[PDB]
Amino acid sequence: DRINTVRGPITISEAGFTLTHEHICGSSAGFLRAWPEFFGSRKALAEKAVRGLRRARAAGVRTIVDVSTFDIGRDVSLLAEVSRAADVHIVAATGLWFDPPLSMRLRSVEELTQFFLREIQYGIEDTGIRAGIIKVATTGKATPFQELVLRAAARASLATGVPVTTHTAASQRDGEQQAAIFESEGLSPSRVCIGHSDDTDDLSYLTALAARGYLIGLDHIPHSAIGASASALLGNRSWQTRALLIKALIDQGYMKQILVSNDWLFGFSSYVTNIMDVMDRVNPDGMAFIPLRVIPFLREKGVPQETLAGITVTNPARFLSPT
Amino acid sequence: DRINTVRGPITISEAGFTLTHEHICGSSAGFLRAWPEFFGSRKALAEKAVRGLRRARAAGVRTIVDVSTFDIGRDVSLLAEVSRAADVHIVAATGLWFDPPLSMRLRSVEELTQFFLREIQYGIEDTGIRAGIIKVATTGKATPFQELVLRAAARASLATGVPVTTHTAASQRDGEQQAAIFESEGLSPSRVCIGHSDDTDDLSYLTALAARGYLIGLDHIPHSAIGLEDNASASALLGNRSWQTRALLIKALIDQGYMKQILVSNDWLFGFSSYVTNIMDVMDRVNPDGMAFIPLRVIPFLREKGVPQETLAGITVTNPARFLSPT
Numbered sequence: 001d002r003i004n005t006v007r008g009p010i011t012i013s014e015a016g017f018t019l020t021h022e023h024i025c026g027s028s029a030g031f032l033r034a035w036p037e038f039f040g041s042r043k044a045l046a047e048k049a050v051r052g053l054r055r056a057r058a059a060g061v062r063t064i065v066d067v068s069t070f071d072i073g074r075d076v077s078l079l080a081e082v083s084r085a086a087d088v089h090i091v092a093a094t095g096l097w098f099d100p101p102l103s104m105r106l107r108s109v110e111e112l113t114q115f116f117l118r119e120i121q122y123g124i125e126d127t128g129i130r131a132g133i134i135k136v137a138t139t140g141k142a143t144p145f146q147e148l149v150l151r152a153a154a155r156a157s158l159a160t161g162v163p164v165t166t167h168t169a170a171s172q173r174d175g176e177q178q179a180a181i182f183e184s185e186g187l188s189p190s191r192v193c194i195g196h197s198d199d200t201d202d203l204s205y206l207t208a209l210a211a212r213g214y215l216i217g218l219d220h221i222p223h224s225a226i227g228a229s230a231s232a233l234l235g236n237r238s239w240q241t242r243a244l245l246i247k248a249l250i251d252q253g254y255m256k257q258i259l260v261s262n263d264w265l266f267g268f269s270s271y272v273t274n275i276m277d278v279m280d281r282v283n284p285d286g287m288a289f290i291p292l293r294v295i296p297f298l299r300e301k302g303v304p305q306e307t308l309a310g311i312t313v314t315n316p317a318r319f320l321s322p323t
Numbered sequence: 324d325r326i327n328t329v330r331g332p333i334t335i336s337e338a339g340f341t342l343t344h345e346h347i348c349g350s351s352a353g354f355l356r357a358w359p360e361f362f363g364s365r366k367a368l369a370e371k372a373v374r375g376l377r378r379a380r381a382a383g384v385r386t387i388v389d390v391s392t393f394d395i396g397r398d399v400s401l402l403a404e405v406s407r408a409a410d411v412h413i414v415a416a417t418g419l420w421f422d423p424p425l426s427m428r429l430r431s432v433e434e435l436t437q438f439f440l441r442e443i444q445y446g447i448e449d450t451g452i453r454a455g456i457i458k459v460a461t462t463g464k465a466t467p468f469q470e471l472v473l474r475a476a477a478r479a480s481l482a483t484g485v486p487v488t489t490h491t492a493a494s495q496r497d498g499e500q501q502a503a504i505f506e507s508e509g510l511s512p513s514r515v516c517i518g519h520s521d522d523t524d525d526l527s528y529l530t531a532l533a534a535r536g537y538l539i540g541l542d543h544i545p546h547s548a549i550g551l552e553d554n555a556s557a558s559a560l561l562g563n564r565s566w567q568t569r570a571l572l573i574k575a576l577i578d579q580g581y582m583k584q585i586l587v588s589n590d591w592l593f594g595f596s597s598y599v600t601n602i603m604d605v606m607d608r609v610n611p612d613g614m615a616f617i618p619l620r621v622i623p624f625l626r627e628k629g630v631p632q633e634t635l636a637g638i639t640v641t642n643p644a645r646f647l648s649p650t
């Protein structure tokens with residue numbers, strides 16, 4: 001009954017309170033190694049990450065799933081270092097996001113499957129650290145390459161038991177096409193999380209997917225720019241409006257299909273220069289936003305602690321456990 | 324008279340026969356480390372590189388300039404390993420090619436200048452290995468980002484003396500726009516090489532750049548897809564012009580008095596992941612000599628056509644020496 005982390009295998013019970021969609025650093029392949037000064041220094045980024053993970057730990061978090069893929073600049077050595085120093089388990093990811101380089105974007109579905117399988121079965125780079133989740137993405141209707149990635153993710157999941165988590169443009173209802181592609185491959189809906197689902201107010205869309213067995217990733221809760229580049233990224237909808245979608249799905253009877261997270265980071269190079277400073281001012285709680293602000297909000301709205309423990313401990317454990 | 328290599332600083336006289344535009348591996352940032360099995364293994368790629376550079380050294384080559392940038396997946400540790408094993412000097416590169424990731428493409432000209440300067444003045448990654456050349460690219464009309472890269476390359480060159488070398492779509496005459504941007508920043512033409520220039524037969528375009536002081540990169544000499552016209556991918560990359568037609572452009576520029584402006588190379592690699600899967604196997608069958616194609620096939624070709632030995636030695640030894648020297 002084991003889940004692979006950056007420090008090795010852990011049992012289901014060791015996972016505890018788990019944030020299912022997080023990042024230590026949102027970057028690009030090889031960027032942190034080639035230009036650490038962008039983040040001040042590698043040491044400055046690592047120290048910031050340790051403090052943020054310790055804040056989350058003190059708030060109840062025991063494990064985070066870093067959904068940073070190869071093209072998000074996942075540096076598993078950094079993840080292992082910060083995991084050790086902060087005493088928080090970190091599950092690493094394979095897959096591809098929306099910035100694949102030529103060496104990835106010109107590959108066949110068979111080759112992409114081999115790559116995802118290499119990171120889950122053998123390890124990431126020369127570290128021996130095995131991926132425990134597959135991250136994929138669509139920003140509207142899937143491009144021919146994105147469809148290949150979704151199929152390769154499904155094939156890698158079916159061969160390993162490792163789950164698939166997605167980035168969606170929720171307003172364009174991407175989850176429906178993602179679902180259709182995954183099902184055509186024979187992938188069980190219970191092994192898939194349709195992420196960034198709190199970016200929409202269309203409850204019928206979320207309820208329809210949850211009814212089919214999909215996990216609904218309400219992971220953009222602190223992403224709100226109420227009050228230019230930050231307004232186009234975070235949005236105009238409040239955290240309360242996003243958090244009420246958790247309550248709405250519990251009221252529909254789909255508490256077992258909900259996964260909550262912050263989609264936070266401590267370094268962010270894949271956007272405008274001072275974006276990390278803007279994000280830190282919008283949400284000073286960081287990864288601690290879910291246990292410090294969202295859980296007490298839901299408690300005062302009438303949601304029991306047994307249901308909230310089910311969403312934050314039981315659901316991620318069932319999702320991450322290789323099945 | 325000191326140039327930076329992957330083994331440390333060497334003197335100008337030690338460079339010798341230099342191939343100005345080469346690659347150990349044409350890939351993408353972080354690719355070699357994440358998926359070495361694409362090339363069989365990192366060990367298989369390293370061994371293939373050592374065998375190729377050893378065959379090139381036996382034929383006369385003493386230095387190769389690896390123009391692989393961050394986005395071409397430059398792994399300086401691999402460059403250092405193969406340089407030492409084959410006893411061939413390798414000059415590493417900074418700059419950005421045409422596949423920059425989001426973290427690079429959203430940067431300002433000032434930020435890009437600081438990155439290029441970091442790789443030249445401090446070192447690449449945590450290796451301490453310093454770049455001795457700046458590689459830039461355009462594929463037709465420059466994109467707003469490519470203009471920023473060209474400007475940052477020029478500013479980095481003016482602060483260090485390190486040369487700039489380019490990738491062009493020669494048929495679209497990219498060298499002219501590149502040249503105009505470099506000169507708008509105050510960069511001297513003698514510090515710039517307009518690469519892939521042998522992809523065109525337009526002698527007027529080549530001679531005009533050479534007259535302004537630009538170095539002409541006739542670096543695609545063995546690139547030909549004749550015999551394999553049924554292979555669309557290989558035809559689009561290598562073209563349908565012979566090595567002789569490409570090599571006759573070296574003779575054409577010598578005859579017009581632009582001897583000091585010529586730089587010859589193979590634009591070869593031992594691993595290639597940034598294109599279709601079968602490409603490295605296709606390319607190795609077209610040119611089994613690899614990087615050894617310039618001293619083995621091209622030099623005796625120009626010798627039988629009437630070109631003197633000191634002229635060819637001036638192109639292969641003196642010109643790269645003057646170009647690579649930080650001035």
Ligand SMILES: CCOP(=O)(O)OCC
Binds near residue numbers: 025026027270
């Ligand atoms: C590094 C960026 O990660 P993300 O979760 O795609 O953020 C925008 C939704």
Ligand SMILES: CCOP(=O)(O)OCC
Binds near residue numbers: 395
């Ligand atoms: C990865 C190398 O790319 P290039 O040298 O621009 O093209 C060679 C055919």
Ligand SMILES: [Co+2]
Binds near residue numbers: 167168196
């Ligand atoms: Co996302």
Ligand SMILES: [Co+2]
Binds near residue numbers: 196199220223233235
């Ligand atoms: Co959003």
Ligand SMILES: [Co+2]
Binds near residue numbers: 021022023067263
């Ligand atoms: Co994310």
Ligand SMILES: [Co+2]
Binds near residue numbers: 491519
């Ligand atoms: Co090129």
Ligand SMILES: [Co+2]
Binds near residue numbers: 346390
């Ligand atoms: Co090249």
